[PDB]
Every structure is written in C-alpha cells, then in structure tokens.
PDB file of C-alpha atoms in Angstrom:
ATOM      1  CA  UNK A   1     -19.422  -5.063  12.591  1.00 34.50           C
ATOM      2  CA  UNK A   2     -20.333  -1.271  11.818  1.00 35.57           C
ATOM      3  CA  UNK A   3     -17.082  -0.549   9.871  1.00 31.87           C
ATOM      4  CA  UNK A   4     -17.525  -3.508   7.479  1.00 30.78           C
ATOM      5  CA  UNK A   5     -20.969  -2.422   6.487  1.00 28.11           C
ATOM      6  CA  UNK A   6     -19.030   0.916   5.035  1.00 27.87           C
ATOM      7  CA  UNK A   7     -15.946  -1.058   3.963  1.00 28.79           C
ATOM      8  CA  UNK A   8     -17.991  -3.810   1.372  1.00 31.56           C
ATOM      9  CA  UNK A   9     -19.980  -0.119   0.005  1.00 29.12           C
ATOM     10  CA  UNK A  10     -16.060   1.113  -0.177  1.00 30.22           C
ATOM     11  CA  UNK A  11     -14.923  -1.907  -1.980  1.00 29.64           C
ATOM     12  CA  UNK A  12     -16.632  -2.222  -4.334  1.00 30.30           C
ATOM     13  CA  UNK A  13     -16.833   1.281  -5.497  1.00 27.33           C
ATOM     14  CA  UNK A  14     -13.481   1.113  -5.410  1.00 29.27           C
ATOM     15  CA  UNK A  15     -12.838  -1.518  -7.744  1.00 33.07           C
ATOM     16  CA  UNK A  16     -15.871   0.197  -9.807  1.00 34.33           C
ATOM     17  CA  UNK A  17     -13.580   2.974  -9.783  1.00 33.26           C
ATOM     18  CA  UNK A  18     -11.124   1.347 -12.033  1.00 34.05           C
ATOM     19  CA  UNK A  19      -9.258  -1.314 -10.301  1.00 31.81           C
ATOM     20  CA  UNK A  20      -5.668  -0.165 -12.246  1.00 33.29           C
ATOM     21  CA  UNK A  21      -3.111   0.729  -9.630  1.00 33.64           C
ATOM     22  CA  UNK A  22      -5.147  -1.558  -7.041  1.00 32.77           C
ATOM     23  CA  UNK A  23      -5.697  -4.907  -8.511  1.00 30.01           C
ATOM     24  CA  UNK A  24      -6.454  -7.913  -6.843  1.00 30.24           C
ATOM     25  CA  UNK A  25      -8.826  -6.521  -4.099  1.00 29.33           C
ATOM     26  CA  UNK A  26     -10.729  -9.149  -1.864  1.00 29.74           C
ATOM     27  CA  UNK A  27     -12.311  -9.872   1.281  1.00 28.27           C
ATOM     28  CA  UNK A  28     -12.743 -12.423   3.508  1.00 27.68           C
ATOM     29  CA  UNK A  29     -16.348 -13.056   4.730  1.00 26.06           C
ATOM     30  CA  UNK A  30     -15.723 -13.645   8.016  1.00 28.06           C
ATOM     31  CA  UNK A  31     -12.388 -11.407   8.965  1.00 29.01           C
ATOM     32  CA  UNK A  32     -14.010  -9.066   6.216  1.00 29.10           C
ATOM     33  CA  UNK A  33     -12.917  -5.861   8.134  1.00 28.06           C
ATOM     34  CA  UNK A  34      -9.329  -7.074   6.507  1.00 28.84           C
ATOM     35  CA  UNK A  35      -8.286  -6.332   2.731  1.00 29.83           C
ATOM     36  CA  UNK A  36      -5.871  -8.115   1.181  1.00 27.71           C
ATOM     37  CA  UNK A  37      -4.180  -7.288  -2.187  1.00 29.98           C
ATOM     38  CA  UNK A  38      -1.468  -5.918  -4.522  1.00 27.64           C
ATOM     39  CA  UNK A  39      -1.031  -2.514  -5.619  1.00 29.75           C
ATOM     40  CA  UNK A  40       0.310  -2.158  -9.231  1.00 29.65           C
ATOM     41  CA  UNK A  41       2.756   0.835  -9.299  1.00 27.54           C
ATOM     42  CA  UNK A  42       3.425   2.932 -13.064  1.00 28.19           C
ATOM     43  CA  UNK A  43       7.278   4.746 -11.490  1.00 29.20           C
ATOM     44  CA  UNK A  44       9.255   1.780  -9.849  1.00 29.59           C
ATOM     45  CA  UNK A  45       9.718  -1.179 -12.096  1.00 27.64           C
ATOM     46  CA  UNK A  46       6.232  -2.861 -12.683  1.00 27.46           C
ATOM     47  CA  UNK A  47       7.144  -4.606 -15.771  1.00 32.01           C
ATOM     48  CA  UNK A  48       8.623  -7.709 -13.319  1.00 32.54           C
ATOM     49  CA  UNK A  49       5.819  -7.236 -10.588  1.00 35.11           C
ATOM     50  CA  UNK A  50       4.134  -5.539  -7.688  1.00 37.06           C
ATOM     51  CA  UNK A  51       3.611  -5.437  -4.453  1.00 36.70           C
ATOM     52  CA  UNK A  52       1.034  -7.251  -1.923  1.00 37.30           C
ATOM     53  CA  UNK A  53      -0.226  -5.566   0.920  1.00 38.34           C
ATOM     54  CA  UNK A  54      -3.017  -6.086   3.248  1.00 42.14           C
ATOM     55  CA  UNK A  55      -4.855  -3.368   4.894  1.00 38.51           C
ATOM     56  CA  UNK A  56      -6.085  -4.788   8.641  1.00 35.47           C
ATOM     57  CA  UNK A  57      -9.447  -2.782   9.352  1.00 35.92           C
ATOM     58  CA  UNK A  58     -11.001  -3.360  12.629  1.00 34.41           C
ATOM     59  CA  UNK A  59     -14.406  -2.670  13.722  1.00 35.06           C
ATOM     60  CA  UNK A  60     -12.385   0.498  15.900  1.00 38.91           C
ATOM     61  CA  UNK A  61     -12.152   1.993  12.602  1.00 36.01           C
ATOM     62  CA  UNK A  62     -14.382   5.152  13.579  1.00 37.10           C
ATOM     63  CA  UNK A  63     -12.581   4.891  16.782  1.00 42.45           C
ATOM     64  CA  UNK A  64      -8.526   4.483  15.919  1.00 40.44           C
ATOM     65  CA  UNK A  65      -6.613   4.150  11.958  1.00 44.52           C
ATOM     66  CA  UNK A  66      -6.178   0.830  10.481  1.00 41.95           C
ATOM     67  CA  UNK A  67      -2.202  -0.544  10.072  1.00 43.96           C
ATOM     68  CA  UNK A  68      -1.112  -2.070   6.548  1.00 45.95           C
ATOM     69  CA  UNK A  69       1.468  -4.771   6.710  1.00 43.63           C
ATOM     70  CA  UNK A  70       3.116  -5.662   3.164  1.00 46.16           C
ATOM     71  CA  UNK A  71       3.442  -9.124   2.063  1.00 43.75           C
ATOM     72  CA  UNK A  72       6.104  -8.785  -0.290  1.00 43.93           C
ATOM     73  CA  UNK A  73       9.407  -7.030   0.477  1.00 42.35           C
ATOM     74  CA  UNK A  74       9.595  -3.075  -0.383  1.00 39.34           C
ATOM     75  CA  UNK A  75      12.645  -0.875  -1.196  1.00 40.71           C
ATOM     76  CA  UNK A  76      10.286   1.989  -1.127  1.00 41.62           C
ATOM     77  CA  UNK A  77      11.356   4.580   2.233  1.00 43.74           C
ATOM     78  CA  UNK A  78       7.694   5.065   2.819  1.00 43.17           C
ATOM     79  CA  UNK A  79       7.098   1.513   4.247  1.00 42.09           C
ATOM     80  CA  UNK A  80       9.242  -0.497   6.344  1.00 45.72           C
ATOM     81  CA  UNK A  81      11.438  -3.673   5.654  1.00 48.23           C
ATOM     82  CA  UNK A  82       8.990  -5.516   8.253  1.00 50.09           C
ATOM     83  CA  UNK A  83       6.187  -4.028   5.337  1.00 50.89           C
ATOM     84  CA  UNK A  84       5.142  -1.478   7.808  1.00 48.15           C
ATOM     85  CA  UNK A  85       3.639   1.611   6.767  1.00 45.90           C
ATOM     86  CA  UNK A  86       3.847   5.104   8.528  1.00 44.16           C
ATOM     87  CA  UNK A  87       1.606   7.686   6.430  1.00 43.75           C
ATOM     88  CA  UNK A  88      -0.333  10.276   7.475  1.00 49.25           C
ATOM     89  CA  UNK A  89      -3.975   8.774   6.180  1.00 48.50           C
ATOM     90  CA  UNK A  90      -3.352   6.503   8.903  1.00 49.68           C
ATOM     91  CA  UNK A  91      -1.350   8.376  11.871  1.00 50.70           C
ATOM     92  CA  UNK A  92      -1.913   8.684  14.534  1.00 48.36           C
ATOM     93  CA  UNK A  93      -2.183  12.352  14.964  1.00 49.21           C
ATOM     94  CA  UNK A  94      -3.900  12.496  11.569  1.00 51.22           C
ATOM     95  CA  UNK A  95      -6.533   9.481  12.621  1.00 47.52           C
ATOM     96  CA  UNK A  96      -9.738  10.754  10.736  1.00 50.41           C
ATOM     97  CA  UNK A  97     -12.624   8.717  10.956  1.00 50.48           C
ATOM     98  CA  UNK A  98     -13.670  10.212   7.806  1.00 53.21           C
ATOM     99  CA  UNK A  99     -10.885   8.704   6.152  1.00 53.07           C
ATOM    100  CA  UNK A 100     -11.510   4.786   4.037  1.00 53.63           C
ATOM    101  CA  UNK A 101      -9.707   2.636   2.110  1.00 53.41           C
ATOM    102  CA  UNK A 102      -9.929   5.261  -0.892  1.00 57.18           C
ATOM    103  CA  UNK A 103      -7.246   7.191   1.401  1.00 58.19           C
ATOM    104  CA  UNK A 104      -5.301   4.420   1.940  1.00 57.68           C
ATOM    105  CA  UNK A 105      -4.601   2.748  -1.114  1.00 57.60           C
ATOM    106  CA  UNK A 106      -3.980   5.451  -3.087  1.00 54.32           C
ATOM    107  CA  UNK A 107      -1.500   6.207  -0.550  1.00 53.84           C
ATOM    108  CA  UNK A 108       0.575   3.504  -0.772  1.00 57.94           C
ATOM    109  CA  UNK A 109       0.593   3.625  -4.836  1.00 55.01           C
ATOM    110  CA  UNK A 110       1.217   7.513  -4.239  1.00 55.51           C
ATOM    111  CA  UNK A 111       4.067   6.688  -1.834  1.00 54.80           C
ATOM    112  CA  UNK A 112       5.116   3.536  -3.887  1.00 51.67           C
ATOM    113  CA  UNK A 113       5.180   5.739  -7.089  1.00 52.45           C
ATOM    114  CA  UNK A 114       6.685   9.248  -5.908  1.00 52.01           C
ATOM    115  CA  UNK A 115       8.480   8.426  -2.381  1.00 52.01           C
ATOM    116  CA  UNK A 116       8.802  11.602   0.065  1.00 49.62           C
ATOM    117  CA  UNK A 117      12.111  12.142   1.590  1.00 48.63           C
ATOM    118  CA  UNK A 118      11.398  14.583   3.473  1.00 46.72           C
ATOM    119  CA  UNK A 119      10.617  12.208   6.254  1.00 46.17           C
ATOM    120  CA  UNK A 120       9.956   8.752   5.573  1.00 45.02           C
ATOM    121  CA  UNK A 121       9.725   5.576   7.597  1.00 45.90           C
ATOM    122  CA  UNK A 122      13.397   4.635   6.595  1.00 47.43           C
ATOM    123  CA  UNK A 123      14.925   8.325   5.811  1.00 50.36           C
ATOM    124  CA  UNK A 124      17.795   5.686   4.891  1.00 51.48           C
ATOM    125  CA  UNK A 125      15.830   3.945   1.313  1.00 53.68           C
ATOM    126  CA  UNK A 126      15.216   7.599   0.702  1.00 51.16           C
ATOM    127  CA  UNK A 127      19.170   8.912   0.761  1.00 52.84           C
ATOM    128  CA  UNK A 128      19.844   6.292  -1.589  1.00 52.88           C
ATOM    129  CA  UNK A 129      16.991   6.903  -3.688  1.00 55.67           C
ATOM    130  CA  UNK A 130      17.750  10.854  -3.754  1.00 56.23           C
ATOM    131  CA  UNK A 131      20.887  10.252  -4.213  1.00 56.00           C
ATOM    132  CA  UNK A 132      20.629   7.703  -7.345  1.00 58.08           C
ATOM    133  CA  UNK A 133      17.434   6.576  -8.074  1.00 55.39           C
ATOM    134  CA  UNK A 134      19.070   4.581 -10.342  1.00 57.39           C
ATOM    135  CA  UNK A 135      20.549   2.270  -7.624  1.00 52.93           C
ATOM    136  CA  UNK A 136      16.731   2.303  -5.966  1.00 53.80           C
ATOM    137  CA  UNK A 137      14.861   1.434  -9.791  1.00 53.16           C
ATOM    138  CA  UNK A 138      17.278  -1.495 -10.684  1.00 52.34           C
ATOM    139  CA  UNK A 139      17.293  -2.629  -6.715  1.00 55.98           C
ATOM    140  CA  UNK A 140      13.118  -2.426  -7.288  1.00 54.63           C
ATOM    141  CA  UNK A 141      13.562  -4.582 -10.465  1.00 54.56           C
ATOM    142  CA  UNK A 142      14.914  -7.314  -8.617  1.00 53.90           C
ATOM    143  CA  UNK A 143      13.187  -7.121  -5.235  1.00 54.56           C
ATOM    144  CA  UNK A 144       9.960  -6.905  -7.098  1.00 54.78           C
ATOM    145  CA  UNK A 145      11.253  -9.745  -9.502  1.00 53.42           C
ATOM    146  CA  UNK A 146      12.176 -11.747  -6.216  1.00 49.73           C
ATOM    147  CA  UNK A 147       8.953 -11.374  -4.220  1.00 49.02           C
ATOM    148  CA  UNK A 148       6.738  -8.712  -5.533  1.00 50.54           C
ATOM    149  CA  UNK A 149       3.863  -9.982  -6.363  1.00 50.63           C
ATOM    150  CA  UNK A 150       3.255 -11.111  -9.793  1.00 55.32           C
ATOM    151  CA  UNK A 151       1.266  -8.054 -11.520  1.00 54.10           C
ATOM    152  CA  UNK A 152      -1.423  -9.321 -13.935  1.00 53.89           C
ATOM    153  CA  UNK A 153      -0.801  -8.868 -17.757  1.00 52.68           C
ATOM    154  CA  UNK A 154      -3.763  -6.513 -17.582  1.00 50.79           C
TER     155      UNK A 154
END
C-alpha cells in the first residue's frame, strides 16, 4: 500500500481544507485505499439532501485512475444512473498520476453544481436540463429528497 500512504496525507488535508462541499469523509482501515462519503452541492437543491459517493482507490493509483460509484441516485448528466462517473480527472486518456482526491471531489461538486453539456455521460439529463432546468431542479428536489443522502444541518 504506496497509494494509501499519500491518500491518509490527502485526507486529511482535505477535510483541514474546509470539509463544506465534501462532508462526511472516511476511511476504512483495512480497504483504506477506498473513500466513502457525500458531497454537499450549493446549485441543485441541497436544502432536502445530497449525494453519497465513494471514490474506489487502488494501490494502481500511480499506475491507472480510480472509478467513483454513487450511492444515492443522481439526475446530474455528468454521472450515470448506475452512479457512474466519466470526468476527465479520472479518464482514461487524461489518467495523471499527479492527480488525488483534491481533483476528484471537487469534480463531482463542480459537475454536481454546474453540469457540462457539451458532452456528458448521459447527453440525455443534460437536454432536459438545458432545456428547463427547472424540470432538472424540482426533479433534484425529489430524487435528492428520495435517496440523496441526508446533508448535515451544518
């Protein structure tokens, strides 16, 4: 375990950092390598919850990118219904070994809070939403009110 010497250091800088859009950051001590979380976004609805993810971070991280898997169902183009994530912190083609869980995270919030269009992982949650957001934010008020993760009070 090379990677999860880096990762802890990583950690707990970020939460350090200010644990605002990231919240509920921990780590196994055994399967370590993996994250698990939620990820409080400010642009889709908050106010009724968030969204869990879980960041999978092998010992190949200098070697290959990590995957993310969310927990909770999205309505955000970016990730997939499955919770898959496409972005290019962790692509392949864009697989730095420079990159951390820094990158990553603030993808997702970046991604959760200002989708791209342009070419997402469902170009489909993206028509609607550039179309009418307005269908996408109410949608988000449910689906994060049905399983998003319950967002802290602070």
């Amino acid at each position: 375990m090379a990677a999860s010497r880096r990762l802890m250091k990583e950690l707990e800088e970020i939460r350090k950092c200010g644990m605002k859009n990231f919240r509920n950051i921990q780590v196994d001590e055994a399967n370590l390598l993996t994250w698990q979380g939620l990820i409080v976004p400010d642009n889709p609805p908050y106010d009724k919850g968030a969204f869990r993810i879980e960041i999978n971070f092998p010992a190949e991280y200098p070697f290959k990118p990590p995957k993310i898997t969310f927990k909770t169902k999205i309505y955000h183009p970016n990730i997939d219904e499955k919770g898959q994530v496409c972005l290019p912190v962790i692509s392949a083609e864009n697989w730095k070994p420079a990159t951390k869980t820094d990158q990553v995270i603030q993808s997702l919030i970046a991604l959760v809070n200002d989708p791209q269009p342009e070419h997402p992982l469902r170009a489909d949650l993206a028509e609607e939403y550039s179309k009418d957001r307005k269908k996408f934010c109410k949608n988000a008020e449910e689906f994060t009110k049905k399983y998003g993760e319950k967002r802290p009070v602070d």
